[PDB]
């Protein structure tokens, strides 16, 4: 089923590789792993659009776990100041990296632990490995599609668990906020590399899932939206709504790390910007497209580990 | 021929 | 025709943006330019299959330009060690001299009975090296290095050049890129990632099998041999394949199966290095030289690579 | 799926 781990009587291990050639990725298209995937997908980007008008200050849901999911990125947020990164050419992945994953891999299983409530713990290996591979790559010091693929995974497990009821899009709002802004200062601190990257033929070096969130968030109102896809190309109207929308984040965090005349660098964003005359089309658009230039691109999805518990290699 |  | 230059009777300008768009990328591929730089691609790329065991400390070429261009790449070099870093700001810098200097050196360069010929050329060169103020490199740089050494060419300034020239200078050439890249931090312009060729280069790698291509199967190396880290090292001098390889390999980190995903695949596939060159030529004519992202930055005059049909 |  799409949506419940069937907690309890369904067993949890450590995942391992599925994705391993060009078949390998194909089969992986027809997975019961995927259909969850895509369902929860689903679901956050319609809650999203509930949110078009977050609270920019917000700190707690009133569910227990986004609250943990919250308080345990916060943790290995703090993470990245024990591990002050290494000085010459900020070009290439810098190499304090490895040390900061070290030093995560080791108290995860701890974190994760406190976080569920004990009846839980039987799923960590599971989590840990969702959760732990949401921030870049290891040893190739890269970050992208694949690990923002994984942090979504992450929180489609918890909730697989039945421990987000009723979860309104400020939740989804609250917790991916603080997952991009540590991602936003991993990717600059660490100056990572991307992974999965389809350079200037796609959508954003590291993010795919920022745009259908943001775009998801403006879906409903289009026209009396705060700013109008045309728009998001105004450097001065994104800065004022990079806190409320993930969209004008999203851009204004390119718009910091690239040179150049946008259009330049970033032609696909730029051909929508000037395209798409609104953000429900955005939105259908660049979920057709996630399920194509993520979900079933190999270079991209091969780091996706399956268990037994969470995201299965079944068939249908 | 260009990307979009 | 494709080989020479009307001389003087073909007249010169600053060269001026002319693909703009799909539709024009499409016409560009009959535009007399284009021939001109395929018909240098196959010369230097069967030249230098002569050329597999090039002198790796040799400095001059036995003809007059090759080592005044030499010169003229080496007057730039020193420019960068005289602009050090804060892509990396004191790079505008740099390029800011390049053209406060430049057209200047290639005055030298050439017989005063030619200066005409500069505003092109110091247009093409002068942006060999990455852009002004996007602060990246890619092959549209690495091409207009070619169309540089081809407007050379085209006056006929290389009589009887050799692949032992056609290394020599590029050998040079990426001497300084490898730098400006490190020293500058210069990103990747208009690239595939992972499903393009090389973050940066195309044509180290068209050279660099041509040169082992003749022989093959008596090669230093095999084409499945560029995956062992030292046995590429010890060819990076002499080879521009393994030079390139070389460079993925000290630059990114992870295995090489995962983040050069196209080299990989053809080292472990295409089995001779002929064949591997010959790949990688009608492969820089796609994902090079039909792609718009690439070669936009591409600017014609009326003299070297002018924007006209066949 | 993966590039060749
Ligand atoms: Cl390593």
Same mark, same amino acid.
């Given at each position: 089923?799409?949506?419940?781990?069937?907690?309890?009587?369904?067993?949890?291990?450590?995942?391992?590789?599925?994705?391993?050639?060009?078949?390998?990725?194909? /089969?992986?298209?027809?997975?019961?792993?995927?259909?969850?995937?895509?369902?929860?997908?689903?679901?956050?980007?319609?809650?999203?659009?509930?949110?078009?008008?977050?609270?920019?200050?917000?700190?707690?849901?009133?569910?227990?776990?986004?609250?943990?999911?919250?308080?345990?990125?916060?943790?290995?947020?703090?993470?990245? /100041?024990?591990?002050?990164?290494?000085?010459?050419?900020?070009?290439?992945?810098?190499?304090?990296?490895?040390?900061?994953?070290?030093?995560?891999?080791?108290?995860?299983?701890?974190?994760?632990?406190?976080?569920?409530?004990?009846?839980?713990?039987?799923?960590?290996?599971?989590?840990?490995?969702?959760?732990?591979?949401? =921030?870049?790559?290891?040893?190739?010091?890269?970050?992208?599609?694949?690990?923002?693929?994984?942090?979504?995974?992450?929180?489609?497990?918890?909730?697989?668990?039945?421990?987000?009821?009723?979860?309104?899009?400020?939740?989804?709002?609250?917790?991916?906020?603080?997952?991009?802004?540590?991602?936003?200062?991993?990717?600059?601190?660490?100056?990572?590399?991307?992974?999965?990257?389809?350079?200037?033929?796609?959508?954003?070096?590291?993010?795919?899932?920022?745009?259908?969130?943001?775009?998801?968030?403006?879906?409903?109102?289009?026209?009396?939206?705060?700013?109008?896809?045309?728009?998001?190309?105004?450097?001065?109207?994104?800065?004022?709504?990079?806190?409320?929308?993930?969209?004008?984040?999203?851009?204004?965090?390119?718009?910091?790390?690239?040179?150049?005349?946008?259009?330049?660098?970033?032609?696909?964003?730029?051909?929508?910007?000037?395209?798409?005359?609104?953000?429900?089309?955005?939105?259908?658009?660049?979920?057709?497209?996630?399920?194509?230039?993520?979900?079933?691109?190999?270079?991209?999805?091969?780091?996706?580990? =399956?268990?037994?518990?969470?995201?299965?290699?079944?068939?249908? | #021929? #260009?990307?979009?």
């Amino acid at each position: 089923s799409l949506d419940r781990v069937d907690w309890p009587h369904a067993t949890f291990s450590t995942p391992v590789k599925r994705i391993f050639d060009t078949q390998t990725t194909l /089969d992986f298209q027809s997975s019961l792993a995927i259909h969850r995937i895509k369902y929860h997908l689903h679901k956050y980007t319609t809650l999203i659009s509930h949110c078009s008008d977050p609270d920019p200050h917000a700190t707690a849901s009133s569910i227990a776990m986004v609250n943990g999911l919250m308080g345990v990125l916060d943790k290995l947020a703090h993470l990245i /100041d024990e591990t002050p990164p290494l000085p010459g050419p900020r070009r290439y992945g810098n190499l304090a990296c490895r040390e900061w994953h070290h030093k995560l891999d080791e108290r995860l299983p701890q974190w994760l632990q406190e976080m569920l409530p004990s009846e839980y713990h039987e799923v960590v290996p599971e989590l840990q490995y969702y959760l732990g591979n949401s =921030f870049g790559s290891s040893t190739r010091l890269d970050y992208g599609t694949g690990h923002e693929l994984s942090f979504m995974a992450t929180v489609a497990a918890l909730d697989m668990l039945g421990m987000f009821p009723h979860m309104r899009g400020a939740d989804v709002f609250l917790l991916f906020n603080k997952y991009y802004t540590i991602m936003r200062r991993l990717i600059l601190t660490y100056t990572l590399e991307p992974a999965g990257s389809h350079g200037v033929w796609g959508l954003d070096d590291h993010f795919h899932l920022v745009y259908i969130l943001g775009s998801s968030q403006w879906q409903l109102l289009d026209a009396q939206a705060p700013l109008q896809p045309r728009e998001i190309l105004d450097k001065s109207l994104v800065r004022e709504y990079k806190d409320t929308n993930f969209y004008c984040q999203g851009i204004n965090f390119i718009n910091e790390v690239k040179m150049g005349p946008f259009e330049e660098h970033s032609p696909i964003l730029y051909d929508i910007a000037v395209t798409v005359p609104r953000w429900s089309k955005v939105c259908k658009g660049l979920l057709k497209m996630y399920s194509v230039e993520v979900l079933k691109k190999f270079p991209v999805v091969q780091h996706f580990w =399956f268990g037994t518990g969470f995201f299965p290699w079944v068939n249908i | #021929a #260009a990307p979009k």
